[PDB]
Write a protein that binds this ligand. Structure first.
Ligand SMILES: *[C@@H]1O[C@H](CO)[C@@H](O[C@@H]2O[C@H](CO)[C@@H](O)[C@H](O)[C@H]2NC(C)=O)[C@H](O)[C@H]1NC(C)=O
Ligand SMILES: *[C@@H]1O[C@H](CO)[C@@H](O[C@@H]2O[C@H](CO)[C@@H](O)[C@H](O)[C@H]2NC(C)=O)[C@H](O)[C@H]1NC(C)=O
Ligand SMILES: *[C@@H]1O[C@H](CO)[C@@H](O[C@@H]2O[C@H](CO)[C@@H](O)[C@H](O)[C@H]2NC(C)=O)[C@H](O)[C@H]1NC(C)=O
Ligand SMILES: *[C@@H]1O[C@H](CO)[C@@H](O[C@@H]2O[C@H](CO)[C@@H](O)[C@H](O)[C@H]2NC(C)=O)[C@H](O)[C@H]1NC(C)=O
Ligand SMILES: CC(C)CCC[C@@H](C)[C@H]1CC[C@H]2[C@@H]3CC=C4C[C@@H](O)CC[C@]4(C)[C@H]3CC[C@]12C
Ligand SMILES: CC(C)CCC[C@@H](C)[C@H]1CC[C@H]2[C@@H]3CC=C4C[C@@H](O)CC[C@]4(C)[C@H]3CC[C@]12C
Ligand SMILES: CCCCCCCCCCCCCCCC
Ligand SMILES: CCCCCCCCCCCCCCCC
Ligand SMILES: *[C@@H]1O[C@H](CO)[C@@H](O)[C@H](O)[C@H]1NC(C)=O
Ligand SMILES: *[C@@H]1O[C@H](CO)[C@@H](O)[C@H](O)[C@H]1NC(C)=O
Ligand SMILES: CCCCCCCCCCCCCC
Ligand SMILES: CCCCCCCCCCCCCC
Ligand SMILES: CCCCCCCCCCCCCC
Ligand SMILES: CCCCCCCCCCCCCC
Ligand SMILES: CCCCCCCCCCCCCC
Ligand SMILES: CCCCCCCCCCCCCC
Ligand SMILES: CCCCCCCCCCCCCC
Ligand SMILES: CCCCCCCCCCCCCC
Ligand SMILES: CCCCCCCCCCCCCC
Ligand SMILES: CCCCCCCCCCCCCC
Ligand SMILES: CCCCCCCCCCCCCC
Ligand SMILES: CCCCCCCCCCCCCC
Ligand SMILES: CCCCCCCCCCCCCC
Ligand SMILES: CCCCCCCCCCCCCC
Ligand SMILES: CCCCCCCCCCCCCC
Ligand SMILES: CCCCCCCCCCCCCC
Ligand SMILES: CCCCCCCCCCCC
Ligand SMILES: CCCCCCCCCCCC
Ligand SMILES: CCCCCCCCCCCC
Ligand SMILES: CCCCCCCCCCCC
Ligand SMILES: CCCCCCCC
Ligand SMILES: CCCCCCCC
Ligand SMILES: CCCCCCCC
Ligand SMILES: CCCCCCCC
Ligand SMILES: CCCCCCCC
Ligand SMILES: CCCCCCCC
Ligand SMILES: CCCCCCCC
Ligand SMILES: CCCCCCCC
Ligand SMILES: CCCCCCCC
Ligand SMILES: CCCCCCCC
Ligand SMILES: CCCCCCCC
Ligand SMILES: CCCCCCCC
Ligand SMILES: CCCCCCCC
Ligand SMILES: CCCCCCCC
Ligand SMILES: CCCCCCCC
Ligand SMILES: CCCCCCCC
Ligand SMILES: CCCCCCCC
Lengths: 527, 527
């Protein structure tokens, strides 16, 4: 029909002669949204001639429908159902009492079939190549894990097949899109410590290195603002529309703060139950815990005008529509106070599901504290790798212990619930529990990749370390060349998951190939 | 007022009570355009109350106005005048006989003042630096002259201040925009011979070099089609809208043909009145003259359906509107027959002044013959430089003789007239006289640059050889980053020549600086 992607048709037939009905729709994904009007169905004029009206219901999450008499304002009938994509459904409001029956006129399609098939294709290629091949300085695992994070960032930015789980969550919880930036920050902290230790061991001065750190940070911030943020298809750059926060700006600020902290308190690596790497850097831990206490205090105790104190919700229609302009809480208030709504992100992810009107920037000022905490945990991983490079058992024990500690903290904060924790997982706020959850994930990934890629050498990292060696050039590249063929062509069906998924997979594989080609030519750009 | 850039206001007052008037406007730049309706002025209803109507007239070229009685269809009054930018003019159609008087209510502005001031600023900086500095393998002149051509290409592509002489001519004649692509083709031929001779002297095989030539040509064509032509701000690429011809596609075809010809007939350089470089390559000259005869025959003798034979005009309203869909003649007919109107250039330069509706591609199939002839003349310049490298007098004599011969041929063809020659100068057709004119210009530029930059060493080429060493990266770069700040920001006045000129000059100087930075880092990309 005229159905768009991820929608179904709902035909509502009114068999009642006396009472009109109004239909209210609420998603199950919401936490405390309001019911929104779906369609108004008038009363049947004559017996045997039911009135009809159609509507489109979202099929990404389960739906909650409410039937209310428009004059009486009384609930005659309520049903909750999970509609399928491109379905054709009929709802009949019978008489004798009032009851509703939902019939499936046409069965919906399987929307996740291309994703199921894509994993089978990739799994088959892995087995075929492994079967085919069998018949016939730097840590590799850090580059491999950086390349995996970057590859998924490229796939997600292109759209992720237009799938709701390859996109960012509206407010709370995790999708696959929410995993890949914290992991990159973690790895960047590891690389900060490893590179700094090698450089200082070679005998370089700390002031030349400080100048290099400042130059790299300034370059990243400027590249983000001037190249990566703006949509130059709309028009030329004007200052009043410039968005100051961003991904590369926050990488730059995090890089400066973490690198300068490590450089200031740098120590030579000494050469087995011990806490040597934890106690030899107690000043850094002291400053990190003080900074984290600052984030917690400004988040739960800063009074925001016209808004509750310590509010972590999305606003819009969320929390029963009480707080419509309070998207973010103190984080958004600080962003608006210091930068103004026109220098923020005008399309927050909460807009689709909570219908928020205010601009909110996920990469704002207040969450940089937790970005820094994430990168400092990555630094701790690098310290584990260098202080105990001789012994593999020591490295693995420390990775496992850190994963368990951070996972226990995350379980305590979130209460293993999406919206009911003390600090729920939230990318937009860059919560504490978001950091601890994604850090335990990164410690587990290192625990698995270090033996396989580095100790045993079973796997060489292919093809993931090729973009892990040219991360900055690949990230800037796909932003500049996002609309260019062959990364993007014209689709026969823009309402198809299969066609979008094929386009995005092809474009991501092309950036893996481009990075491999740059590796063969030894064209490594280090910002 | 509401006047746009390069327009004036013309108020027409009708003092006549009985006859209406219609006003016809024709530009002086046209060759045989039709008069187009400007505005209809009704008769004055009562004596002493003249009727009024306003119009905007283009001020780039002189205007020709015709006053015709609408019923009688008889010419009551005609005047030709050159209106100035943003002027406020009044035209009064008096009675006793009928006479017209044009009065300047408000004087126009000086539109060329920013260009006059810009040359004074640049001239002052040259004198200041020369005064300041005084108080305190490869041929350099070829890189210098390539950099000058490329710098002007960047300035012209950005817009050239929105000045009509920094844009391409509508059909015939020369502007500053029409000079810089033929010069680049000339220099590319010189570089082809110089590089090939050095490579073959080092002992390289001709098949490895043939593979390199084919690879470079294929890369240039593909880069042009996929990166340089499309406007990806409009949408994703669809095949039916893909434009096949272009600047880099024609560089690729010309490079392949000329490089393969030289490689096939390559000879070692022997070590003073002689014609050694002209006679040692007689096969190349034979094929070039045969190819030129093909261009002349297909242009003046190919029968084009529904069109005169040997037609070199623009169509539209040109040539008195007889031939509206004949833009190009045989060149456009061959393009349309082999590629179809949707794979051609939809905005030819003749559209503005002759109002042509058909798509015409300046870089089409038929003019590649003359592109090849231009590059082969460049090859002859390289042969002069190598065969006689010991003697400067021999090099200068040969450059002067070639300039005089080509200039005499161009004077014979064009009859020193813009539209009345046998083969007028025309970028869109890539005429023979266009090639000979621009080749004599390039020989004269070499005659001046070779002693100054190479023999005496008075000038080192700065800052022009920095982009001459990275021409391909600079050309692709400014196409990718054309809309990006700092190359383009939002203008306070979009109807100002001063603001556009400042923007374009700043952007061009920024690309000179970028190429200097790439030279300092030794990042030279050779396609
Ligand atoms: C959804 O399904 C219903 C079936 O209930 C379709 O209704 C049919 O509509 C056509 C034309 O409008 C009628 O000729 C049929 O008699 C209807 N069938 C029934 C059972 O009433 C409806 O068209 C479908 N909508 C779509 C496919 O977009
Ligand atoms: C549909 O009607 C029901 C009535 O059964 C509404 O539910 C009541 O809403 C009022 C607010 O107007 C509350 O004070 C009551 O506590 C609710 N429950 C009951 C049992 O009355 C419901 O709000 C209506 N739907 C919408 C979207 O307004
Ligand atoms: C162009 O110049 C004429 C002067 O002839 C301007 O006409 C004036 O218009 C204003 C308002 O429309 C009147 O109050 C004046 O009396 C007019 N002057 C005369 C001498 O008639 C006209 O406005 C100008 N157009 C512009 C500046 O856009
Ligand atoms: C304006 O009127 C003049 C008449 O003086 C037109 O000039 C004549 O045009 C006809 C064509 O309709 C020719 O056959 C004549 O040779 C032209 N000259 C004369 C002296 O009659 C002129 O064409 C009219 N302007 C426009 C735009 O049609
Ligand atoms: C360094 C770590 C341990 C924490 C430092 C920051 C703490 C001490 C600061 C940051 C923001 C501060 C809050 C800001 C505003 C208000 C005003 C008033 O209504 C009571 C105090 C209260 C609620 C402050 C309490 C202290 C506070 C939470
Ligand atoms: C190699 C150089 C010297 C020239 C070779 C091309 C010449 C011989 C060819 C190219 C196109 C040809 C023309 C194409 C079509 C027509 C058809 C008819 O109406 C008479 C011949 C005529 C007019 C041809 C004459 C010869 C021609 C001009
Ligand atoms: C999350 C989906 C993205 C899919 C990316 C898979 C990468 C496939 C790599 C293909 C190119 C390999 C080039 C290097 C070979 C040595
Ligand atoms: C046709 C107008 C374009 C103006 C271009 C002039 C170039 C000015 C160069 C400024 C940057 C110099 C960098 C290299 C210094 C050694
Ligand atoms: C139902 O709505 C219609 C308007 O569409 C209205 O005229 C009618 O009065 C309503 N029903 C009742 C019972 O009021
Ligand atoms: C002039 O034009 C008007 C229409 O604007 C028309 O009514 C009038 O008749 C014309 N003049 C003559 C003399 O016909
Ligand atoms: C590179 C290959 C991309 C393939 C993506 C998976 C598409 C599967 C289509 C399944 C249709 C039901
Ligand atoms: C959507 C809510 C997510 C909450 C995540 C809670 C689990 C924390 C991690 C558990 C241990 C991780 C070991 C790899
Ligand atoms: C199904 C909808 C949400 C998708 C789940 C993503 C969050 C958990 C990812 C687990 C990754 C584990 C890596 C060690
Ligand atoms: C000997 C080389 C010195 C190079 C510069 C060192 C100092 C750099 C200071 C950067 C501080 C930035 C503050 C925002
Ligand atoms: C030797 C080159 C020094 C250049 C320094 C430029 C300023 C950098 C400051 C960046 C700070 C960003 C994080 C606060
Ligand atoms: C070998 C020279 C050692 C000198 C100590 C260098 C410490 C650098 C501290 C950086 C602080 C910057 C604050 C913005
Ligand atoms: C050289 C020994 C110094 C010991 C200082 C006290 C230990 C500080 C460790 C802080 C770690 C907190 C997070 C694990
Ligand atoms: C080689 C030395 C021992 C390797 C142990 C690998 C640990 C990986 C843990 C994975 C848990 C699912
Ligand atoms: C770089 C400098 C660009 C200057 C361009 C010339 C502008 C002159 C303005 C004159 C106003 C009348
Ligand atoms: C617009 C018409 C241009 C015609 C150019 C004719 C002149 C030919 C060149 C004269 C000799 C050149 C020596 C540098
Ligand atoms: C004034 C309108 C046309 C502009 C003239 C451009 C054509 C002649 C350029 C001469 C360049 C000479 C280089 C040797
Ligand atoms: C020994 C190396 C050989 C490399 C390839 C040489 C042959 C290339 C042929 C290209 C022809 C292109 C025709 C359009
Ligand atoms: C050794 C690499 C050879 C690659 C050859 C690719 C085909 C090139 C043909 C280009 C022809 C363009 C002008 C006719
Ligand atoms: C040293 C080897 C010499 C062999 C001769 C090479 C000649 C190359 C001719 C290229 C013709 C290509 C036609 C498309
Ligand atoms: C080795 C001597 C061969 C002589 C062949 C005849 C001369 C051909 C020269 C053609 C030049 C035409 C353009 C100047
Ligand atoms: C050094 C040897 C002589 C140099 C002669 C320069 C010729 C330039 C001709 C310019 C004519 C205007
Ligand atoms: C630190 C980098 C800041 C760059 C800001 C660029 C925005 C200026 C736009 C001006 C257009 C009128
Ligand atoms: C209809 C599909 C057109 C594009 C197919 C994918 C192209 C990817 C490979 C291109 C290599 C440059
Ligand atoms: C020689 C290079 C040709 C590249 C052609 C690309 C155009 C294909 C667009 C397909 C989109 C459906
Ligand atoms: C209003 C003018 C804003 C931009 C001025 C020119 C900027 C060019 C220099 C930028 C260096 C990156
Ligand atoms: C979602 C994984 C797809 C893997 C396909 C790999 C083929 C290049
Ligand atoms: C400021 C955006 C464009 C940067 C140009 C650099 C090209 C290598
Ligand atoms: C690098 C130059 C920036 C200019 C900013 C202008 C803001 C109005
Ligand atoms: C012997 C292993 C010690 C690991 C300590 C981890 C601290 C969270
Ligand atoms: C510095 C710790 C602040 C914790 C805030 C919790 C208040 C309910
Ligand atoms: C860094 C940009 C500051 C803009 C001023 C806004 C103050 C509310
Ligand atoms: C060979 C040492 C194994 C250490 C295991 C630690 C927990 C997975
Ligand atoms: C460090 C874990 C804390 C868990 C929440 C305790 C109640 C504020
Ligand atoms: C130094 C500015 C970044 C240049 C863009 C790179 C695109 C691959
Ligand atoms: C049109 C020439 C302008 C030269 C200005 C140079 C200043 C960088
Ligand atoms: C095909 C257009 C994009 C090319 C990407 C190459 C980036 C270095
Ligand atoms: C490189 C692939 C090109 C695909 C062309 C498709 C034309 C319909
Ligand atoms: C002695 C100089 C000869 C130059 C010949 C030029 C041929 C057009
Ligand atoms: C091959 C020369 C053709 C010249 C055409 C001129 C006819 C008037
Ligand atoms: C090379 C593109 C050819 C397109 C076919 C058009 C035939 C008139
Ligand atoms: C020193 C030799 C001069 C040659 C001049 C030729 C014509 C400018
Ligand atoms: C080679 C010069 C020719 C000039 C025109 C002669 C008449 C067709």
């Amino acid at each position: 029909a005229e159905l768009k992607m991820d929608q179904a048709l709902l035909l509502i037939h009114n068999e009642l002669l006396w009472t009109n009905l109004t239909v209210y729709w609420k998603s199950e994904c919401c936490y405390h949204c309001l019911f929104q009007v779906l369609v108004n169905v008038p009363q049947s004029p004559k017996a045997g001639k039911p009135s009809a009206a159609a509507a489109s219901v979202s099929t990404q999450h389960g739906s909650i429908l409410q039937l209310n008499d428009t004059l009486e304002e009384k609930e005659v009938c309520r049903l909750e159902y999970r509609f399928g994509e491109f379905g054709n459904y009929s709802l009949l409001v019978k008489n004798i009492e009032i009851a509703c029956d939902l019939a499936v006129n046409e069965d919906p399609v399987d929307s996740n079939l291309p994703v199921s098939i894509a994993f089978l294709i990739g799994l088959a290629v892995i087995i075929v190549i492994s079967f085919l091949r069998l018949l016939l300085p730097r840590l590799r695992s850090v580059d491999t894990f950086r390349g995996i994070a970057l590859i998924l960032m490229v796939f997600v930015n292109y759209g992720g097949g237009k799938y709701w789980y390859f996109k960012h969550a509206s407010w709370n919880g995790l999708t696959v899109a929410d995993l890949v930036f914290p992991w990159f920050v973690f790895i960047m902290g590891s690389s900060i410590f490893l590179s700094m230790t090698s450089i200082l061991q070679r005998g370089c001065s700390k002031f030349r290195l400080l100048g290099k750190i400042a130059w790299r940070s300034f370059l990243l911030i400027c590249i983000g603002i001037i190249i990566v943020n703006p949509n130059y298809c709309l028009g030329p750059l004007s200052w009043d529309k410039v968005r100051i926060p961003g991904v590369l700006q926050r990488l730059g600020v995090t890089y400066f703060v973490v690198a300068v902290l490590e450089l200031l308190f740098a120590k030579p690596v000494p050469e087995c139950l011990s806490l040597r790497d934890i106690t030899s850097s107690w000043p850094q831990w002291l400053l990190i815990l003080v900074l984290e206490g600052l984030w917690l205090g400004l988040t739960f105790l800063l009074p925001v005008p016209g808004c509750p104190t310590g509010y972590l919700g999305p606003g819009g229609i969320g929390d029963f529509g009480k707080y419509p302009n309070c998207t973010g809480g103190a984080a958004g208030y600080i962003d608006r106070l210091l930068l103004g709504d026109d220098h923020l992100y005008q399309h927050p992810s909460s807009a689709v599901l909570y219908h928020t009107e205010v601009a909110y920037d996920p990469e704002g000022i207040l969450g940089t504290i937790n970005s820094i905490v994430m990168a400092f945990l990555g630094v701790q991983a690098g310290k584990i790798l260098l202080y105990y490079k001789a012994r593999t058992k020591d490295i693995l024990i420390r990775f496992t212990a850190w994963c368990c500690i951070l996972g226990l903290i995350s379980v305590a904060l979130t209460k293993v619930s999406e919206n009911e924790g003390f600090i729920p997982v939230n990318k937009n706020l860059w919560s504490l529990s978001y950091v601890t959850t994604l850090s335990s994930f990164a410690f587990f990934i290192l625990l698995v990749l270090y033996p396989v890629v580095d100790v045993k050498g079973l796997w060489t990292g292919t093809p993931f370390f090729y973009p892990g060696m040219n991360s900055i050039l690949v990230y800037v590249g796909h932003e500049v060349f996002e609309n260019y063929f062959p990364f993007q062509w014209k689709l026969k069906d823009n309402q198809s998951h299969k066609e979008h998924l094929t386009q995005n997979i092809v474009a991501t594989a092309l950036w893996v190939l481009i990075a491999y080609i740059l590796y063969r030519k030894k064209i490594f750009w280090k910002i």
